Design a protein around this nucleic acid. Structure first.
Lengths: 220, 222
DNA sequence: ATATCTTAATTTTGGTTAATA
DNA sequence: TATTAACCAAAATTAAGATAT
């Protein structure tokens, strides 16, 4: 999952990115609405962390622009003014969460994880398939599967986004630090790794390929 | 601190106790050497203050006994005989100190504090794991683990920077000398011995490696 | 034709094992 | 012992051809 930060204050923007990266997220920062708006046009972000109090934005337009271009991107607003009405304006403007500044980073990461779970649970438990992304483990029928690294991350991403196709660019954007540089075959070798150690041996078809579209996780 | 008072005079013994509790010492009292030894068997007292003059009058036989049964305990002897011989013959009997009566409870309290001061320890202790850097002793749940040499110092530096991560270079500059003339693999072979000796038989990750970051001590278990 | 799938080589990054200063 | 050399395992990544659409 890729997070984007738009903090006008220089020090805060940094601290946030460092904490987020430590957790396990891919990250890009912005200090401007214009600079932000460019990023959201080149890359896909799973969540955007923006300040309502920016010099070059009203907040409400910021939240509106992003949720129009990237309609599946989540918007979390941060404000030093956590007033009742400031919050309501943000949420009404299309924000998905509102947090007060100064920040509790332990609570932020929890909400970020909840927002990227897509309504799911932390441990993804479909049938006898159990993917614990936190301990990096996949178990089917009590039997353990051995998938690790990027290849495991596209599987959880494909599972968080089940019954939906995910373009190779989004998998790149979500999991690789510099998605533009890596060749898009990294994604295909990963899917082969997954299928080889899951779909092929366990007589199943978890991932489906859709030409000029992407891949789609299924468990029918 | 637990101090034991063996005094024949009840007057004083109550006074000795009252001042000693006022300072925050656990304190038990007696008037019989027999009684004293009993407490010793059941509990460990950091110090025992006792009168040189008692009905028993065993003298050294008291100091030598207390030390024999419980050697980590100190013996301070109280007497109203101030003669040099009394003092000397008592200290030569094993007394760690000789105070005089009439008693100056102010001095008395200061001297007990000095006989009980522990000082500074470099020992690191976590759960069942204790790391004694001065004795080169790593014991887990009473089970000495055989880590020695640079591996030991590497483990120490990490523990001292627990949670935090230490670069291979930091470890090199600290534990090793002239880091410009050592193969960095020395750290890998060090972490291996560390894991091979402790992390493994202890069945709990001791050290964790972080990509391009190095290692950080991680003991969040038994 | 393109699109991707597989398999292989290569690179990176520590971990392991002995031997030998 | 402490230091090294050789060796292993793993991920990453890119390449190439194969195979499917």
């Amino acid at each position: 999952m890729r997070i984007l930060v738009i903090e006008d204050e220089i020090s805060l923007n940094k601290t946030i990115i460092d904490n987020l990266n430590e957790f396990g997220y891919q990250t890009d920062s912005s200090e401007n609405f214009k600079d932000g708006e460019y990023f959201i046009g080149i890359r896909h972000y799973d969540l955007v962390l923006a300040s309502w109090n920016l010099p070059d934005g009203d907040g409400a337009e910021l939240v509106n622009t992003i949720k129009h271009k990237s309609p599946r991107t989540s918007v979390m607003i941060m404000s030093a003014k956590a007033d009742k009405d400031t919050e309501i304006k943000a949420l009404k403007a299309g924000a998905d969460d509102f947090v007060k500044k100064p920040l509790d980073f332990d609570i932020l990461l929890a909400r970020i994880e909840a927002r990227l779970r897509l309504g799911g649970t932390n441990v993804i438990k479909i049938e006898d398939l159990v993917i614990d992304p936190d301990e990096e483990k996949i178990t089917y029928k009590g039997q353990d599967i051995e998938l690790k690294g990027k290849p495991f991350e596209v599987l959880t991403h494909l599972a968080r986004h089940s019954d939906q196709i995910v373009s190779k660019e989004q998998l790149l954007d979500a999991i690789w630090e510099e998605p533009e540089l890596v060749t898009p075959n990294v994604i295909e070798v990963a899917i082969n790794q997954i299928r080889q150690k899951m779909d092929k041996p366990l007589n199943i078809s978890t991932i489906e390929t859709v030409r000029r579209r992407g891949y789609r996780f299924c468990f029918p």
